[PDB]
Point group: C2
Chain length 361, copies 2
C-alpha cells in the first residue's frame, strides 16, 4: 500500500479563541486583508472579535465584505485587481466556505501579480502566496483545514483547485449559534458528506479513516439537535466539520460532490443539500466495490443514511428538464472525482442517480 | 473545552517508501547527518535503502551508528562534539525511539553551538534547529510524528523535552518484520499506552480521540498475531504506532508513562513493557474521574485491558527493595504528568499501583 498524511494547519478551537490564541497571527506580519461575506460576520460577533484582535496586535487592515455565495472568477478579480495595489502580509478568511475559499485564491494572486484566476488551476503556476488565516462561522465546509478553493467559472461551472493549507485556523463555536435551522442543516450535511466521501474514497487512508469515523458518529448523534438550535450539539457539529475537513484534505471528494454542483449553480440548492441528495445513490454504485465500508456508513447513521437524510427533510422538489438532466449527466461523466470513486459509473448510472435523488420529493 | 491540533509532519507510508517518495528530502539540503543504532538498520535493509536514497538524491552524509538504547546526555554530546566542526543541512533519524529522539536533540545542538544538552529543556533557548527526517523501524514509539525527545540525565533519570516536529516521516512496514517477538511485544505495548493515555488524558481533544480510538482497535485486533510474526498484523501495528504518535503529539502522556521510567532505568525493563505493566492500575484510579472512557478502553480490549496484557505475557518478575519502592513513589508524586492524569493519586495509591504491577508475576 501507499499513503500520505499532511495537514500542517495549526488549529485552535474554543469559546473566545481569538482572544486566547489569536495573537499568534502577529508572526505573519503587520498588515492584513480580511475577506468576508456581506452581513453574517457582523451579526455573530466574529468581525468585531477580529477587529479587536487586529487592534490588539497592532496590525493594520482593510475589509472586503463583498464575497458572494459560491464566488465567481470575476468576484475574485474585483478584489485582486484592487488589492494588488496595496501591500498585505497575510489574508484572513472570515465566514463560511465562500469567503474562506475566496481568501486562498486572493492570497496567491496578491503574491503572483501576473497570474489570472484560470492559472490557479495549474498547480505548476502556484508556487508563491501570502499566508492565510481562516476563521470559520459555519459547521461546515472544513475549508479552514484544507488547501482547496472552489469557484464558479465564466461558464457557470463549479470548479475546484488545490492551493495552500491555511497557517492558522481559529474555530469559535459561538459564531455558529446564529445559523438559521436551514443553514445548520445544509452545512451539517456538507460536513457529513465530507466525512462519508472521504471514508469511501479510493484515496482513503488509515489516519483519515480514523478522523472520518469519529466525525460520522458525532454528526449522527448531533445533527438533528443542532438544527433545532441546541448549542451543545452545534458545538459538536463544528468539531465534526473540522475533522471532516481534515479528512478530505487527505482524500479529496467523490462523484457525489461533483454531481451536486449543477443543482447549486442551476437550481439554487445549497451546496450541502445538493451533495447530500445524491450521496446515498452514489453509494449504491460504490457498493459494487466496497460493500463493507458502505455498510459501515449506513450502520453508523442508524441503519440507513438515506433514511437519516430523509428524516432531516433534506430532499427538495427540483424542476429538471430532460435537456438539463442530459447536460448534467454528460458533465458528471467527465468529473475528475470519478477516478477516486469506487464503482463503475456509466452515463446511465449517473442519470439514475439524479432520477433517484430528484424522485424523493 | 479549548483545544489545539498541530501535527505538521508530512507522513509517507508504504513498502519501498524511501524509493517512491524519499526524493522529497532534496528540498532540505545537500549534506545530512544520519543517526542510528549499531546493527539493526543494517540488517532490515533500512540503512541500505537510506544510503541508496542519499546517493540517488546526490546528498553527502556521515553516519553516527552509535546511539544506545535510552541514550544519555553524554551520548548526545559525543556525537555533537564529533560533528560540530562539520556542516549539515538536515538530520535523519533511523531506527527506533532512541535514534529518532537522538536525532531531534542533535538537530538543535548542531545549529545552536552555544547550547548544552541541559539547555534543551528550556523552551526559550530552543529557537533554531536543522530540519529533521525520521525513519522508524519499530511499531512503535511514534517518535516520527512527535516533537518530543527523551534522554537519561546524569542522575540516571528519564527526562523528556519538547523540541521540533520532523519535516518528513517515512514508514516502510518491511523494516518492522525483522523485530524479535519480544521487541514486537514491547514496542507494541508502547504504542498501545500512547493511544490509551492520550485518550484518557485530561488534555484529550476530539481529533486525538479519533486517532486514539482507531489505534486502540487496530492494536487489540493485531498485537497477538503481530507477535506471532503475521506480516499483515505487523504492518497494521506500524500504522497504529504512527496514529498513536500523532495522538500524544497533542496530549502528552499520563502518570503511567512516568511511573514506568524507574523500571526501565533501574530494572532494565523495556519502555513499553514498563508503562504497560502499571497502566491498568493507573487506569483503575482514573475511574474516579472518567469512568465512561475507562469503560470504553476496557471494552475495546475484549472487556479488560489488564487481562489482555496478562495474556500477552507482559508482566515480569522484578527485584525491588522497600527503599527503591519508596523512592519511586516519592518521585512519582512529583511527576508533571500527574496534572494531566484523571483521578487523585496519593502516595498510598501510587505505592499500590507498583505493588499490583510487580505482584502479577
Ligand atoms: N475548501 C473546501 O474544501 C470546501 C469544502 C466544502 C465546500 N466549499 C465551498 O464553500 C461554499 C459553501 O460555504 P458554506 O456552506 O459555509 O456557506 P457560504 O456560501 O459561505 O454562505 C452561506 C450563507 O450563510 C451565511 N452565514 C455564514 N455564516 C453564518 C452564521 N454564522 N450565521 C448566519 N448566517 C451565516 C452567509 O452570510 P454572509 O454572506 O452575509 O456572510 C451566506 O449568506 C461553496 O462555494 C462550496 O463549494 C469549499
Ligand atoms: N519521541 C517520543 O515521543 C517517544 C515516545 C515513546 C518512546 N520514546 C523513547 O524511545 C525509546 C524507545 O525506543 P524503541 O522501543 O523504538 O527502541 P530503541 O531503544 O530505539 O531500540 C530497541 C532495540 O531494538 C533494536 N531494533 C530497532 N529496530 C529494529 C528492527 N527493525 N529489527 C530488529 N531490531 C530492531 C535496536 O537495535 P540497534 O541498537 O542495533 O539499532 C535496539 O537494540 C525510549 O528511550 C523512549 O523513552 C520517545
Ligand atoms: C483555480 As481555483 C481559484 O478554483
Ligand atoms: C532536554 As531534552 C534533549 O531531553
Ligand atoms: Zn463540500
Ligand atoms: Zn512511550
Amino acid at each position: 500500500s501507499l499513503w500520505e498524511f499532511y495537514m500542517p494547519t495549526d488549529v485552535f478551537f474554543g469559546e473566545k479563541i481569538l482572544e486566547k490564541r489569536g495573537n499568534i497571527i502577529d508572526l505573519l506580519g503587520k498588515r492584513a486583508l480580511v475577506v468576508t461575506g456581506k452581513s453574517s460576520s457582523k451579526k455573530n460577533g466574529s468581525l468585531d472579535d477580529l477587529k479587536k484582535l487586529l487592534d490588539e496586535t497592532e496590525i493594520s487592515y482593510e475589509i472586503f465584505d463583498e464575497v458572494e455565495e459560491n464566488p465567481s472568477f470575476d468576484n475574485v478579480m474585483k478584489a485582486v485587481e484592487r488589492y494588488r495595489n496595496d501591500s498585505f502580509d497575510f489574508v484572513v478568511g472570515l465566514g463560511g466556505g465562500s469567503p474562506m475559499d475566496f481568501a486562498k485564491a486572493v492570497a496567491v494572486l496578491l503574491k503572483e501579480k501576473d497570474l489570472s484566476v484560470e492559472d490557479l488551476y495549474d498547480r505548476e503556476k502556484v508556487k508563491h502566496w501570502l499566508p492565510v488565516v481562516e476563521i470559520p462561522t459555519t459547521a461546515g465546509t472544513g475549508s479552514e483545514v484544507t488547501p482547496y478553493s472552489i469557484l464558479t467559472d465564466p461558464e457557470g461551472n463549479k470548479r475546484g483547485c488545490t492551493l495552500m493549507f491555511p497557517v492558522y485556523a481559529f474555530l469559535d463555536p459561538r459564531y455558529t449559534y446564529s445559523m438559521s435551522d436551514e443553514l445548520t442543516l445544509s452545512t451539517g450535511v456538507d460536513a457529513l458528506s465530507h466525512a462519508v466521501e472521504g471514508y469511501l474514497s479510493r484515496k482513503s487512508t488509515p489516519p483519515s479513516d480514523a478522523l472520518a469515523i469519529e466525525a460520522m458518529k458525532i454528526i449522527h448523534r448531533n445533527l438533528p439537535k443542532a438544527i433545532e438550535g441546541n448549542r451543545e450539539a452545534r458545538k459538536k457539529m463544528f468539531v465534526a466539520s473540522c475533522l471532516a475537513g481534515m479528512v478530505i484534505a487527505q482524500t479529496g471528494t467523490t462523484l457525489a460532490h461533483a454531481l451536486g454542483y449543477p443543482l447549486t449553480t442551476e437550481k439554487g440548492i445549497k451546496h450541502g443539500k445538493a451533495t447530500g441528495m445524491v450521496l446515498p445513490f452514489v453509494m449504491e454504485v460504490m457498493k459494487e466495490e466496497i460493500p463493507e465500508k458502505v455498510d459501515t456508513v449506513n450502520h453508523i447513521f442508524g441503519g440507513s443514511l438515506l433514511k437519516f437524510l430523509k428524516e432531516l427533510g433534506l430532499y427538495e422538489k427540483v424542476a429538471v428538464s430532460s435537456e438539463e438532466l442530459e447536460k448534467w449527466v454528460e458533465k458528471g461523466s467527465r468529473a475528475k472525482h470519478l477516478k477516486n470513486t469506487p464503482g463503475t459509473f456509466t452515463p446511465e448510472k449517473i442519470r439514475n442517480i439524479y432520477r433517484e435523488a430528484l424522485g424523493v420529493e
